[PDB]
Design a protein around this motif. Sequence first.
Motif, PDB file in Angstrom:
ATOM      1  N   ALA A  78       0.829  -1.199   0.000  1.00  0.00           N
ATOM      2  CA  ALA A  78       0.000   0.000   0.000  1.00  0.00           C
ATOM      3  C   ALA A  78       0.865   1.252   0.000  1.00  0.00           C
ATOM      4  CB  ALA A  78      -0.930   0.001   1.190  1.00  0.00           C
ATOM      5  N   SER A  79       2.110   1.119   0.459  1.00  0.00           N
ATOM      6  CA  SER A  79       3.063   2.212   0.334  1.00  0.00           C
ATOM      7  C   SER A  79       3.402   2.500  -1.118  1.00  0.00           C
ATOM      8  CB  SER A  79       4.342   1.885   1.098  1.00  0.00           C
ATOM      9  OG  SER A  79       5.176   1.034   0.336  1.00  0.00           O
ATOM     10  N   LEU A  80       3.134   1.553  -2.017  1.00  0.00           N
ATOM     11  CA  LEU A  80       3.485   1.705  -3.420  1.00  0.00           C
ATOM     12  C   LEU A  80       2.809   2.904  -4.067  1.00  0.00           C
ATOM     13  CD1 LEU A  80       4.113  -0.950  -5.992  1.00  0.00           C
ATOM     14  CD2 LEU A  80       2.248   0.617  -6.510  1.00  0.00           C
ATOM     15  N   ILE A  81       1.692   3.382  -3.519  1.00  0.00           N
ATOM     16  CA  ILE A  81       1.014   4.520  -4.130  1.00  0.00           C
ATOM     17  C   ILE A  81       1.884   5.768  -4.045  1.00  0.00           C
ATOM     18  CG2 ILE A  81      -0.256   5.161  -2.038  1.00  0.00           C
ATOM     19  CD1 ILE A  81      -1.658   5.323  -5.614  1.00  0.00           C
ATOM     20  N   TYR A  82       2.552   5.980  -2.911  1.00  0.00           N
ATOM     21  CA  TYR A  82       3.415   7.148  -2.781  1.00  0.00           C
ATOM     22  C   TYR A  82       4.547   7.097  -3.797  1.00  0.00           C
ATOM     23  CZ  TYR A  82       1.123   8.319   1.629  1.00  0.00           C
ATOM     24  OH  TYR A  82       0.210   8.671   2.593  1.00  0.00           O
ATOM     25  N   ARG A  83       5.167   5.927  -3.943  1.00  0.00           N
ATOM     26  CA  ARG A  83       6.225   5.761  -4.928  1.00  0.00           C
ATOM     27  C   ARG A  83       5.708   6.019  -6.331  1.00  0.00           C
ATOM     28  NH1 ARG A  83       7.387   1.049  -2.662  1.00  0.00           N
ATOM     29  NH2 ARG A  83       7.309  -0.105  -4.641  1.00  0.00           N
ATOM     30  N   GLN A  84       4.525   5.496  -6.652  1.00  0.00           N
ATOM     31  CA  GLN A  84       3.983   5.691  -7.990  1.00  0.00           C
ATOM     32  C   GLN A  84       3.703   7.159  -8.260  1.00  0.00           C
ATOM     33  OE1 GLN A  84       1.060   2.016  -8.855  1.00  0.00           O
ATOM     34  NE2 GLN A  84       1.472   3.373 -10.589  1.00  0.00           N
ATOM     35  N   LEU A  85       3.147   7.871  -7.279  1.00  0.00           N
ATOM     36  CA  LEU A  85       2.879   9.294  -7.465  1.00  0.00           C
ATOM     37  C   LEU A  85       4.169  10.060  -7.725  1.00  0.00           C
ATOM     38  CD1 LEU A  85       0.448   9.440  -4.464  1.00  0.00           C
ATOM     39  CD2 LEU A  85      -0.285  10.048  -6.740  1.00  0.00           C
ATOM     40  N   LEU A  86       5.176   9.855  -6.872  1.00  0.00           N
ATOM     41  CA  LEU A  86       6.432  10.576  -7.053  1.00  0.00           C
ATOM     42  C   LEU A  86       7.081  10.228  -8.385  1.00  0.00           C
ATOM     43  CD1 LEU A  86       7.909  10.528  -3.476  1.00  0.00           C
ATOM     44  CD2 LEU A  86       7.793  12.552  -4.939  1.00  0.00           C
ATOM     45  N   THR A  87       7.087   8.944  -8.746  1.00  0.00           N
ATOM     46  CA  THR A  87       7.721   8.525  -9.988  1.00  0.00           C
ATOM     47  C   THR A  87       7.004   9.103 -11.200  1.00  0.00           C
ATOM     48  OG1 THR A  87       8.669   6.493  -9.086  1.00  0.00           O
ATOM     49  CG2 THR A  87       8.164   6.522 -11.442  1.00  0.00           C
ATOM     50  N   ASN A  88       5.677   9.101 -11.185  1.00  0.00           N
ATOM     51  CA  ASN A  88       4.884   9.492 -12.337  1.00  0.00           C
ATOM     52  C   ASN A  88       4.567  10.976 -12.376  1.00  0.00           C
ATOM     53  OD1 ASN A  88       4.925   6.748 -12.562  1.00  0.00           O
ATOM     54  ND2 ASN A  88       2.750   6.455 -12.116  1.00  0.00           N
ATOM     55  N   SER A  89       5.087  11.763 -11.429  1.00  0.00           N
ATOM     56  CA  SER A  89       4.847  13.205 -11.430  1.00  0.00           C
ATOM     57  C   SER A  89       5.100  13.883 -12.779  1.00  0.00           C
ATOM     58  CB  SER A  89       5.713  13.867 -10.362  1.00  0.00           C
ATOM     59  OG  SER A  89       5.561  13.222  -9.111  1.00  0.00           O
ATOM     60  N   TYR A  90       5.946  13.312 -13.644  1.00  0.00           N
ATOM     61  CA  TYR A  90       6.179  13.925 -14.954  1.00  0.00           C
ATOM     62  C   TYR A  90       4.891  14.015 -15.769  1.00  0.00           C
ATOM     63  CZ  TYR A  90       5.767   9.395 -17.168  1.00  0.00           C
ATOM     64  OH  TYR A  90       5.294   8.191 -17.625  1.00  0.00           O
ATOM     65  N   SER A  91       3.962  13.086 -15.545  1.00  0.00           N
ATOM     66  CA  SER A  91       2.682  13.156 -16.228  1.00  0.00           C
ATOM     67  C   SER A  91       1.915  14.413 -15.857  1.00  0.00           C
ATOM     68  CB  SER A  91       1.840  11.925 -15.908  1.00  0.00           C
ATOM     69  OG  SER A  91       1.662  11.788 -14.514  1.00  0.00           O
ATOM     70  N   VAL A  92       2.237  15.051 -14.729  1.00  0.00           N
ATOM     71  CA  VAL A  92       1.609  16.329 -14.405  1.00  0.00           C
ATOM     72  C   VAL A  92       1.973  17.375 -15.445  1.00  0.00           C
ATOM     73  CG1 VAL A  92       1.604  18.246 -12.800  1.00  0.00           C
ATOM     74  CG2 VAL A  92       1.395  15.896 -11.945  1.00  0.00           C
ATOM     75  N   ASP A  93       3.266  17.513 -15.739  1.00  0.00           N
ATOM     76  CA  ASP A  93       3.676  18.475 -16.754  1.00  0.00           C
ATOM     77  C   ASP A  93       3.134  18.076 -18.115  1.00  0.00           C
ATOM     78  OD1 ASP A  93       5.011  19.439 -14.587  1.00  0.00           O
ATOM     79  OD2 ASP A  93       7.027  19.035 -15.349  1.00  0.00           O
ATOM     80  N   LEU A  94       3.096  16.773 -18.390  1.00  0.00           N
ATOM     81  CA  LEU A  94       2.508  16.334 -19.649  1.00  0.00           C
ATOM     82  C   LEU A  94       1.043  16.748 -19.739  1.00  0.00           C
ATOM     83  CD1 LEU A  94       2.884  14.970 -22.335  1.00  0.00           C
ATOM     84  CD2 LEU A  94       2.832  12.757 -21.207  1.00  0.00           C
ATOM     85  N   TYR A  95       0.290  16.602 -18.647  1.00  0.00           N
ATOM     86  CA  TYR A  95      -1.115  17.004 -18.618  1.00  0.00           C
ATOM     87  C   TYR A  95      -1.276  18.511 -18.744  1.00  0.00           C
ATOM     88  CZ  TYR A  95      -5.599  18.212 -16.482  1.00  0.00           C
ATOM     89  OH  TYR A  95      -6.831  18.757 -16.209  1.00  0.00           O
ATOM     90  N   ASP A  96      -0.365  19.272 -18.144  1.00  0.00           N
ATOM     91  CA  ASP A  96      -0.386  20.713 -18.341  1.00  0.00           C
ATOM     92  C   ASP A  96      -0.251  21.039 -19.817  1.00  0.00           C
ATOM     93  OD1 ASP A  96      -0.502  20.770 -15.595  1.00  0.00           O
ATOM     94  OD2 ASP A  96       1.625  21.243 -15.335  1.00  0.00           O
ATOM     95  N   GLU A  97       0.658  20.349 -20.507  1.00  0.00           N
ATOM     96  CA  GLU A  97       0.769  20.533 -21.950  1.00  0.00           C
ATOM     97  C   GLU A  97      -0.526  20.148 -22.652  1.00  0.00           C
ATOM     98  OE1 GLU A  97       4.244  18.308 -22.917  1.00  0.00           O
ATOM     99  OE2 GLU A  97       5.551  20.068 -22.974  1.00  0.00           O
TER     100      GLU A  97
END
Lengths: 57, 48
Positions: free
Chosen positions: A1-20
């Motif tokens: 269940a800790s894996l969600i934090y890791r996934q969020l931090l790792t995938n944060s680049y999709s935030v900038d992609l979504y901004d684009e």
Amino acid sequence: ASLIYRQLLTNSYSVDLYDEIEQIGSGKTQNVTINPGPFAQTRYAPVNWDHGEINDS
Amino acid sequence: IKENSYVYVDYWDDSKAFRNIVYVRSLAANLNSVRCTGGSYHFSLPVG
């Protein structure tokens, strides 16, 4: 269940992609073509008022 | 003008009610009757 934090931090680049995504989808041209319904409009006519027929002699 | 005769008055106005008179199913109205009187006229005559 800790894996969600890791996934969020790792995938944060999709935030900038979504901004684009959003800030160039706005740039791209869209046109929602609201219709005229099945029932069709029509105005009376070009109507101009004048004095009626005069009985001259 | 006599009982045989009619008299016509064309009328129009730039209000909403009159501007909407293009198509009509029924148009009724009542008016006040009035008296029309005739004045005097001197027949300009170069003698007599």
